[PDB]
């Protein structure tokens with residue numbers, strides 16, 4: 026006895042929930058399987074708790090650094106990490122309850138268990154067979170641990186959310202946005218923080234002028250950056266502390282070691298090999314522009330397809346797929362070009378489009394012209410801890426089309442979304458120049474460069 | 476005895492005058508700028524800048540007094556040194572003055588820190604010396620006014636707010652524009668028992684009512700006490716030095732300070748404008764065409780004195796475009812005063828660009844207008860016991876759903892609008908918004924995910 030559905034979604038993360046709900050909105054009978062907690066990485070171990078801890082860091086900077094220069098004094102300051110975590114978990118628990126009510130309203134069927142393939146169009150969940158002509162693999166990814174002696178004494182970003190107290194000393198190893206974000210939060214919350222990168226600078230894919238501001242501010246306040254660093258081994262002393270040994274002979278003793286050296290897709294444990302789905306050279310599920318796998322009736326959306334590991338990409342791709350399969354939108358698909366990103370570093374980095382380096386590689390040096398503005402954020406300008414801001418435009422051709430917009434500085438996290446619309450619409454430097462500024466804001470520096 | 480010739484004389488060293496003088500100098504003009512008070516005008520010394528610094532102080536007060544507890548932070552014996560905040564604020568303004576002097580040196584602008592008075596249409600007297608030029612810009616700005624009632628002298632203007640050295644225990648703010656709403660929110664956050672008096676039904680009457688209703692509801696739950704349909708009849712100074720406002724309906728409200736924020740008037744008196752022939756429009760401002768020309772050839776008026784739109788970026792762009800027209804031969808250069816974005820530093824902050832739903836329905840008819848909204852709680856306040864609402868609204872027109880208005884209220888909205896203002900200037904549609912991928916997690920993503 027096999028139970029039929031119009032759509033089976035494997036994974037209740039950003040990709041699965043979005044695609045499941047949109048499919049249900051268009052009359053499809055949908056089954057969603059989730060082996061862990063609803064909301065996947067974004068809600069339980071990613072964007073959401075990361076942002077809550079980042080706001081905790083912004084409050085920590087107000088109390089320990091800026092409040093004094095605004096005339097506010099106090100004493101017996103104390104920090105209760107368990108209270109911030111309990112409030113963080115209560116908020117996530119309300120997001121879980123909200124998704125469930127949504128499923129009760131739209132009629133999505135959910136099974137909180139592991140889905141395993143039997144063949145290309147049939148899955149087994151809790152000893153019951155389910156079949157559908159449309160199956161979405163939305164299994165996400167997982168953190169990677171290096172093949173280094175003692176690597177098991179360290180934790181990943183999952184481990185960061187399991188901490189119950191600020192470590193006195195923390196080592197963060199990695200050079201991507203997660204390494205930089207977690208290092209900044211631990212530093213703001215009072216941990217002696219050391220960040221280790223293997224090459225010359227962090228965030229290698231982001232505009233160098235922007236990252237250089239971040240590196241300089243880290244050297245003034247932030248975590249201690251160690252460049253050209255390779256961990257040789259990690260030893261756990263009998264006193265429970267960890268000793269990191271670098272290939273160059275240096276060593277650092279810490280209380281916690283966070284590995285943020287990459288993520289890999291969840292491809293094993295669910296008989297993916299019984300479907301015939303093929304992987305690309307990168308090791309992700311191979312898909313076309315419409316998220317079709319190599320097998321008809323099987324789609325792959327989110328981190329598991331390796332295109333862009335961002336929640337809004339997974340959400341939009343999943344909704345556009347449901348539109349295509351169940352609302353007759355044959356040509357519906359996501360444009361993965363010019364997707365804006367915000368890194369909750371200290372200060373915050375916002376970016377959309379090409380770095381100067383990427384524009385030069387795609388259009389040639391003569392065609393590229395950049396505009397930039399450096400200034401101190403008014404918020405920090407009245408204090409003894411002045412923080413720089415840098416906003417940059419990357420333009421190409423005689424009409425100076427804006428192919429990239431990047432910023433670093435206080436409040437940049439909320440500035441990018443509107444500009445990402447203008448760039449999607451083909452904005453030129455003349456469109457920016459014809460827009461009247463909003464004063465006083467940091468965002469106005471984007472439209473007043475000459 | 477001798478008249479000194481210049482190519483361009485600029486009366487006033489505020490947002491309009493500095494912008495027009497520097498741009499004219501970059502184009503080779505011999506420029507003279509007169510400033511009778513401080514360089515930077517209202518914006519730098521008594522407007523945008525000191526107002527924003529005090530707004531940041533209010534945000535810090537809200538962190539210490541309301542939100543820190545829910546983020547796990549505790550402390551005792553909190554104290555607030557208003558004089559230290561004010562000292563740091565004025566030191567920042569002193570550095571801004573020096574930046575303007577540095578720019579005049581680089582561009583080659585001649586400046587005199589004295590009051591300019593017209594002798595005739597093409598001649599001014601400054602410090603006893605006559606200067607003449609075929610191009611003269613009046614960029615004199617405006618000033619706050621006091622109501623013509625008994626005891627009005629006991630109140631202070633926004634200028635008096637910046638002169639305060641301590642937070643008043645009780646403050647009355649009379650006014651319904653952005654200045655009254657911003658100063659009431661700052662006083663309330665800094666600990667003053669604040670009362671806001673408006674003559675009509677709601678404040679910010681020109682803004683979308685859906686947005687302002689969220690502001691009014693937030694004030695009722697936590698902010699200043701709003702008094703509607705209030706007319707101040709007189710103010711009495713009590714023997715204990717407190718003040719009592721008498722309303723026309725007979726109500727009495729006792730306070731320590733009373734701020735008048737009932738409107739500004741243009742600076743038209745004291746500089747012999749009556750010797751130029753320049754005429755005023757029926758609104759009482761210097762009359763101008765779309766090119767900032769006064770009724771007298773060779774005299775121009777930019778900024779608050781022309782009454783078109785009292786914002787710093789407007790004064791700056793119009794002053795720059797005027798100099799492009801007079802000294803760079805750009806014959807048709809002029810500022811477009813429509814679709815100018817504004818941010819009101821209320822609690823929570825309001826951002827707005829284009830038409831309100833009511834204004835769109837009036838110009839295009841309900842049949843052609845469709846609005847979209849997103850209602851949510853800012854994540855920053857959502858983990859606390861003091862959840863703050865956010866509301867974002869899109870006003871669309873016709874079959875292509877052209878975005879004619881974009882408005883928001885909520886934590887962080889002040890920095891979200893500039894980019895959308897570019898999209899709306901370029902003629903964005905709901906389809907352009909839908910095709911832009913969101914940035915998560917941010918409040919700004921709610922503007923592109925409405926259905």
Ligand SMILES: Cc1cc2nc3c(=O)[nH]c(=O)nc-3n(C[C@H](O)[C@H](O)[C@H](O)COP(=O)(O)OP(=O)(O)OC[C@H]3O[C@@H](n4cnc5c(N)ncnc54)[C@H](O)[C@@H]3O)c2cc1C
Pocket residue numbers: 035036037038039040041058059060061062064065066067070071072075138139140141163164165166182203291295326327328329333334335336337339914915916
């Ligand atoms: C620390 C961190 C911070 C981040 N910050 C941001 C940010 O600020 N902004 C942003 O846009 N992105 C951010 N991301 C990325 C974002 O979280 C991911 O891109 C997004 O969650 C991917 O969604 P998904 O649906 O592809 O996968 P996931 O959210 O991982 O969902 C996959 C789900 O499938 C389940 N599953 C797997 N196999 C099975 C099976 N056989 N049966 C049933 N269920 C199964 C898993 O248990 C999991 O719940 C961050 C990520 C991390 C780790």
Ligand SMILES: Cc1cc2nc3c(=O)[nH]c(=O)nc-3n(C[C@H](O)[C@H](O)[C@H](O)COP(=O)(O)OP(=O)(O)OC[C@H]3O[C@@H](n4cnc5c(N)ncnc54)[C@H](O)[C@@H]3O)c2cc1C
Pocket residue numbers: 463464465486487488489490491492509510511512513514515516517518521522523526589590591592614615616617633654742745746777778779780784785786787788790
């Ligand atoms: C409390 C407050 C808050 C504000 N907040 C904002 C905001 O957040 N954003 C925004 O965009 N706008 C804001 N504004 C408005 C902004 O300050 C004005 O629109 C702007 O200053 C107008 O510039 P202006 O050049 O027309 O006039 P002003 O900046 O007022 O400049 C006029 C100058 O001319 C001088 N002057 C006058 N007559 C003579 C003479 N005969 N000879 C020599 N000098 C003379 C004066 O001394 C003065 O310095 C605010 C205003 C106030 C009062």
Ligand SMILES: Cc1cc2nc3c(=O)[nH]c(=O)nc-3n(C[C@H](O)[C@H](O)[C@H](O)CO)c2cc1C
Pocket residue numbers: 511512590617618742744745746
């Ligand atoms: C008769 C008269 C003389 C003035 N003289 C000066 C002056 O010498 N310096 C100055 O900065 N402002 C002067 N002002 C303007 C005034 O001080 C200030 O700009 C207020 O904004 C106007 O109410 C004068 C105004 C008038 C009416």
Ligand SMILES: [Cl-]
Pocket residue numbers: 042043046047
């Ligand atoms: Cl959804």
Ligand SMILES: [Cl-]
Pocket residue numbers: 200201202227228229230231
């Ligand atoms: Cl990177």
Ligand SMILES: [Cl-]
Pocket residue numbers: 231232233234380381382383
């Ligand atoms: Cl670069």
Ligand SMILES: [Cl-]
Pocket residue numbers: 199201203204285286287288
């Ligand atoms: Cl990583």
Ligand SMILES: [Cl-]
Pocket residue numbers: 401406567570
């Ligand atoms: Cl400064």
Ligand SMILES: [Cl-]
Pocket residue numbers: 493494497498
């Ligand atoms: Cl300028």
Ligand SMILES: [Cl-]
Pocket residue numbers: 630631632633634635636
């Ligand atoms: Cl006063």
Ligand SMILES: [Cl-]
Pocket residue numbers: 650652654655736737738739
């Ligand atoms: Cl006013």
